[PDB]
C-alpha cells in the first residue's frame, strides 16, 4: 500500500533517510517480515492437508451430497490459496524497494 | 520467485490434467511427476525462507552499521 | 444377442462423446485451469451443468455465434460443422447445456 | 484378461532375484541368502524363461499382426498386454541376455573339468561346492554390470515384492506353524490335540491370495465355500469354478468354463483338490 | 478440629513411580509403608462433601492415566537415558537423552485430563533440546501417542547426531579466522522425511542430504530404515567447482546401492559421523 521508500532512490539517501524518524519504518518492516516468517509455516501445513484430503478422495464418500460438500469445501480451499497467494505478492511487493537496495550494494562492492 | 510460485500450482493442476485425462489405474511417470512436483515445490518454499531470512539479517546488520 | 451388442454401441458412443467433450472443454475454458479441474471433476461425478456454479464470466460473442439467432446468420458451413459434430453445443445465460442424444435417462458418470 | 492377473505375479517374481542381486553383492558371506545362486544354476530354468520370453513375443507379435477390430472396446485387454511388458521396471530384452550369458559360461565350466554333482548341486542343492568356490565369485561380479546398468537401482531395493508365498512361513498360519508334540509320540498328530482356534482346516493357512491366477481373493469368493485347499502343500485355490462377473471383462451373468478347470481335482504339486469345510 | 480431610490410599505394587518427585500434586507419600499415601482438602461447614469427593476422584483418574503412560513408555522407552526430572499434575518433565543438565527436560508433554482419559498428549520440546525443530508437526498432526514415542524412541540417535553437526557450527569465536563460508540448517518437509542443506552463499552451491523413512522387505517383513541419499537432482557434472567432495563422498561411502545407504538407527550415529568426518 503505502510507499514509504520512494522508487529510484539511490542506497546512501536511504540511509539517510532511515538514520532518523525513530524507526518507525523499521518496526513496521520488522512486523512484516515477522508475520511473513509465521505465514510460511501455516502455508506448508494446508498445502500438506490438501494433499491428504485428495490422496483420501476414495474413502468416506457414500453420498452424491458429500461429494457435493466435500468438492465444495476444496474449491473454497484453493480459493484462499489464491487470495494467500495474492496476500503474499502484496507482502513481497511492499519490500521490493527495501530489497532492491541489495543488488546495488553487491555490485558496489564487487 | 514470484513466477515460480504460480507455476507451481498451476502445474500441480496441469500435471494433474494428464492423470484425470485417462480417467475422463494409474501410470507411474505421472505420479512420480507428481512426487517431483510437489517436493519442488517444498523445496522452493524452504529456499524462499532461507532468502528471507538472510535478506533480513542484512537489513539488520547494515540498519546497525 | 441383440444385449451387448447395444451395451458395446453405447460405449463407443460414450467413448466418442468423452473425445468431443473434452477437446471442447480444453479450448473454452483455457484461461482457467480451476473452471476446467472443476468442471471436469464434477463431470466425472456426474453433476448436470445447469448446478454447479462458475467463477468466471465466459464472452457473450461466441454464445452469439454458436446459435446465431441474433442480428447475424449462422453460416451454412457452421451448419454443416454443428451437423458433423457428434455433441450439440449451445450456452444459455453464460452456462452450456449437455443431454445425451441416445440415452434420455440419468446416466451416471461417476466412477 | 484373465492372464494379467498371472502376469502381475510373473513380474513380481524377477524382481525378487535381482533384488537379492543387489543385497548379496555387500556381503558374499551370508548363507541365509545362498537361494539365490541356485535359481540361476539351474539349466532348463533358464531355458523355460527364455521359451515364455520367445512366446511372449510370439503372441505380441502376433496380436499385433493380428488385433481386434470388429469391437475396439474389448482391445482393453490386448493393450494392457503390451503395456504391462513395457511399464515393467526391468526391461525384459536386458533380462533376456543376462540368462542366456549364464548358459554359455555354465557349459565350458564343464569342458574345463568334468563333473556330474554341479548338475545337482545347481538343481537341488542350490549351492556351489567348495572346490569350485572360484566359480561363486563370478556370480556377484558380473550381475551387477550386466541388467542393472539399464534399470533404477533404488527403486528396485526398496520394491513391494513381499507376498509371493514362495516360504512356508507365509503358508500356515502362525499359531500352528512350529512343532506341537516330541518325536517320541511320533508325526502324526490327532486333530483332538489342535488348538481351539485352529482345530479347523479354515484356520490353517492365509486365505488371502490365489495360487493358480495369481489374483487376490475378496471377500465374495472367501464366504462361498467354492474354494479347494491342497492337502500336500496347503495351498489354497477356488480353481474349477465358474468365476464371478466383477472378475469378468464386463459384468454379465453368462458363465464360461476358464482354464481353472484343469486342476479340479489335481492341485499343482500334484496333490488332490477338496472343496474346504465352513 | 484441624479442618481438613485427607484421603489415604495404597498402592498394590512397588510401581517405580513412587521414587519420582510428586509434589507438585500435593500429595503427600506415608513414611511407615512407602506404598501408602493422601489427598488432602480444607473445608467449611462440612455438609457439602461433593466438592472434595469430585476433586480427589479427578486427582486420581489423573494419577490413574499418568501411571498409564508411564508404563507405556517404560515398555516403549527401555533406554539408559530415561529418567523423569520433575512430576506435575499439568505437565510431565522426562529426561530421555544424554543431556547432562540435570533440570533440563529434554522432553515436556503437558496433560490435559478429561472425565476418564486424557484429552490430548501435546509433545513440547526444550530449545537447547535440538528435536524442538518437529514441535509444529507434532502439534498439527493428531497420531497416536505411541507412535510420536516409537518415533522419538527410533530418531533419537538421528536428533543426538545432528545436534553435534549443529553444536560444531554454533561454537562460539576460538580465535580462529576460519570463516567457513558453509552453514549448516535444516529442512522440513514432513514428519517422514528430514533433510539437511548446506548453505555457500560466497562459491554459490548447494549440499543438500536428504532422510527419508522407506520401508524395505526383508526375509519376507518390511523393515522402516533411515535413507540417507543424494536427491535425484543431484546429478553433478565433473565440472562444477564444489563437485569434488560430493565425489569424494560417493566414492568413499557410495547398505550401499550407488546413490541410497540404509541404515539401522543404532549405527547411523558413527556412520553420520562418518560422512560428516570428511565434512569436518
Known amino acids: 500500500m503505502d510507499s514509504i521508500i520512494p522508487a529510484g532512490v539511490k542506497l546512501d539517501d536511504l540511509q539517510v533517510i532511515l538514520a532518523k524518524n525513530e524507526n518507525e519504518t523499521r518496526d513496521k518492516v520488522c512486523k512484516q517480515i515477522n508475520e511473513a516468517r509465521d505465514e510460511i509455516l501455516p502455508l506448508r501445513l494446508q498445502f500438506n492437508e490438501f494433499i491428504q484430503i485428495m490422496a483420501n478422495i476414495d474413502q468416506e464418500g457414500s453420498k452424491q451430497a458429500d461429494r457435493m460438500a466435500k468438492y465444495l469445501h476444496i474449491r473454497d480451499k484453493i480459493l484462499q490459496l489464491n487470495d494467500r497467494f495474492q496476500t503474499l505478492s502484496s507482502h513481497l511487493e511492499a519490500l521490493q524497494p527495501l530489497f532492491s537496495t541489495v543488488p546495488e550494494y553487491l555490485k558496489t562492492a564487487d | 520467485y514470484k513466477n515460480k510460485l504460480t507455476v507451481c500450482f498451476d502445474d500441480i493442476l496441469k500435471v494433474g490434467a494428464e492423470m484425470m485425462m485417462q480417467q475422463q489405474g494409474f501410470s507411474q511417470s505421472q505420479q512420480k511427476l507428481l512426487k517431483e512436483k510437489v517436493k519442488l515445490f517444498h523445496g522452493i518454499l524452504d529456499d524462499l525462507e532461507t532468502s528471507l531470512s538472510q535478506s533480513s539479517s542484512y537489513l539488520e546488520t547494515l540498519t546497525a552499521l | 444377442f441383440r444385449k451387448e451388442e447395444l451395451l458395446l454401441k453405447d460405449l463407443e ?85 449437455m443431454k445425451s442424444k441416445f440415452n434420455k435417462s440419468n446416466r451416471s458418470y461417476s466412477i | 484378461h484373465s492372464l494379467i492377473p498371472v502376469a502381475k505375479w510373473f513380474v513380481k517374481f524377477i524382481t525378487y532375484l535381482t533384488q537379492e542381486i543387489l543385497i548379496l553383492i555387500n556381503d558374499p558371506t551370508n548363507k541365509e541368502y545362498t537361494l539365490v545362486h541356485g535359481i540361476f544354476g539351474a539349466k532348463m530354468s533358464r531355458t523355460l524363461i527364455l521359451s515364455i520370453l520367445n512366446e511372449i513375443k510370439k503372441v505380441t507379435q502376433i496380436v499385433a499382426k493380428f488385433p481386434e477390430t470388429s469391437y475396439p472396446i474389448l482391445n482393453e485387454s490386448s493393450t494392457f498386454l503390451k503395456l504391462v511388458l513395457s511399464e515393467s521396471p526391468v526391461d525384459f530384452e536386458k533380462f533376456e541376455t543376462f540368462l542366456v550369458d549364464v548358459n554359455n559360461k555354465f557349459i565350458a565350466l564343464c569342458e574345463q573339468q568334468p563333473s556330474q554333482e554341479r548338475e545337482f548341486s545347481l538343481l537341488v542343492k542350490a549351492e556351489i561346492p567348495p572346490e569350485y568356490a572360484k566359480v561363486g565369485d563370478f556370480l556377484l561380479q558380473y550381475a551387477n554390470n550386466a541388467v542393472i546398468s539399464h534399470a533404477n537401482a533404488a527403486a528396485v531395493y526398496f520394491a513391494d515384492t513381499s507376498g509371493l508365498k514362495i516360504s512356508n512361513s507365509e503358508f ?14 511320533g508325526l502324526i498328530i490327532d486333530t483332538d490335540k489342535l488348538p481351539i482356534k485352529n482345530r479347523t482346516s479354515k484356520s490353517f493357512s492365509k486365505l488371502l491370495y490365489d495360487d493358480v491366477t495369481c489374483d487376490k481373493l475378496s471377500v465374495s469368493e472367501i464366504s462361498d465355500g467354492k474354494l479347494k485347499r491342497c492337502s500336500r502343500c496347503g495351498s489354497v485355490t477356488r480353481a474349477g469354478n465358474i468365476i464371478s462377473s466383477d472378475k469378468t471383462i464386463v459384468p454379465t451373468s453368462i458363465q464360461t468354463k476358464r482354464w481353472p478347470t484343469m486342476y479340479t481335482r489335481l492341485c499343482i504339486c500334484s496333490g488332490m483338490l477338496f472343496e474346504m469345510d465352513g | 478440629s484441624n479442618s481438613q480431610i485427607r484421603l489415604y490410599a495404597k498402592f498394590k505394587r512397588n510401581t517405580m513411580m513412587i521414587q519420582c518427585q510428586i509434589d507438585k500434586l500435593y500429595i503427600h507419600f506415608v513414611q511407615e509403608e512407602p506404598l501408602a499415601f493422601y489427598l488432602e482438602e480444607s473445608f467449611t461447614n462440612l455438609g457439602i462433601i461433593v466438592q472434595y469427593l469430585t476433586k480427589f476422584r479427578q486427582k486420581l483418574m489423573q494419577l490413574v492415566v499418568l501411571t498409564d503412560v508411564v508404563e507405556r513408555l517404560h515398555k516403549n522407552f527401555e533406554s539408559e537415558n530415561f529418567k523423569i526430572i520433575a512430576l506435575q499434575p499439568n505437565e510431565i518433565s522426562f529426561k530421555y537423552l544424554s543431556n547432562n543438565d540435570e533440570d533440563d527436560k529434554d522432553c515436556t508433554i503437558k496433560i490435559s485430563t478429561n472425565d476418564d482419559s486424557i484429552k490430548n498428549l501435546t509433545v513440547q520440546l526444550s530449545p537447547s533440546n535440538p528435536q524442538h525443530i518437529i514441535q509444529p508437526f507434532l502439534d498439527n498432526s493428531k497420531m497416536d501417542y505411541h507412535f510420536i514415542f516409537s518415533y522419538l524412541q527410533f530418531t533419537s540417535s538421528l536428533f543426538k547426531a545432528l545436534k553435534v553437526i549443529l553444536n560444531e557450527r554454533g561454537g562460539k569465536f576460538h580465535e580462529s579466522g576460519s570463516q567457513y563460508s558453509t552453514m549448516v540448517n535444516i529442512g522440513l518437509h514432513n514428519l517422514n522425511e528430514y533433510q539437511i542443506v548446506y548453505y555457500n552463499p560466497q562459491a554459490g552451491t548447494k549440499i543438500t542430504i536428504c532422510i527419508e523413512l522407506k520401508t524395505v522387505l526383508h526375509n519376507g517383513r518390511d523393515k522402516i530404515q533411515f535413507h540417507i541419499h543424494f536427491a535425484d537432482v543431484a546429478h553433478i557434472t565433473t565440472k ?41
Do not use: W
Open chain 4, 172 to 185: 500356515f498360519n502362525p499359531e500352528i506353524f512350529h512343532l506341537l508334540q516330541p518325536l517320541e509320540e
Open chain 3, 13 to 97: 458412443i460414450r467413448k466418442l462423446e468423452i473425445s468431443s467433450r473434452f477437446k471442447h472443454r480444453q479450448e473454452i475454458f483455457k484461461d482457467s485451469p480451476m473452471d476446467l479441474f472443476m468442471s471436469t471433476l464434477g463431470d466425472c461425478l456426474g453433476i448436470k451443468d445447469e448446478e454447479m456454479l462458475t467463477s468466471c464470466t465466459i464472452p457473450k460473442a461466441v454464445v452469439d455465434h454458436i446459435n446465431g439467432s441474433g442480428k447475424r446468420k449462422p453460416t451454412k458451413a457452421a451448419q454443416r460443422a454443428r451437423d458433423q459434430d457428434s455433441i450439440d453445443i449451445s450456452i444459455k445465460d453464460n452456462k452450456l447445456v
Open chain 5, 240 to 280: 562444477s567447482p564444489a563437485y569434488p567432495m560430493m565425489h569424494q563422498v560417493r566414492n568413499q561411502v557410495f547398505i550401499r546401492l550407488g546413490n541410497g545407504v540404509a541404515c539401522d538407527p543404532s549405527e547411523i550415529e558413527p556412520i553420520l559421523m562418518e560422512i560428516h568426518n570428511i565434512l569436518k
